[PDB]
Write a protein that binds this DNA or RNA. Structure first.
Length: 53
DNA sequence: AGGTAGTCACAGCTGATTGCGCTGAGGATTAGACGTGCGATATCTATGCCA
């Protein structure tokens, strides 16, 4: 596996939701290790069983 | 007074019902590092050998 230096990588730029569509990765999600990673126009809700609704 | 259409009492057809199966979301769940122990291994110098 080929690692890279910090100087070889730029800061991650989260997308912006367009037409009310939440972007998804290849895994069909968004990596949110940091709050800055969230795409603009998105809100995180920690409500249990909210996706059911 | 006479017969077949309107009305009521029952029959076939079919949809709803009641046991039972299956997915989708949702909440549960020892491999380079870091050292040492042992083992092979460079490493420095006393000192008397005889020319």
């Amino acid at each position: 596996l080929g690692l890279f230096g910090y100087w070889q990588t730029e800061e991650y730029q989260p997308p912006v939701a367009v037409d009310g569509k939440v972007p998804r990765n290849e895994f069909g999600n968004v990596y949110l290790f940091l709050p800055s990673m969230m795409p603009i126009g998105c809100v995180q809700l920690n409500l249990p069983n909210l996706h059911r609704v």
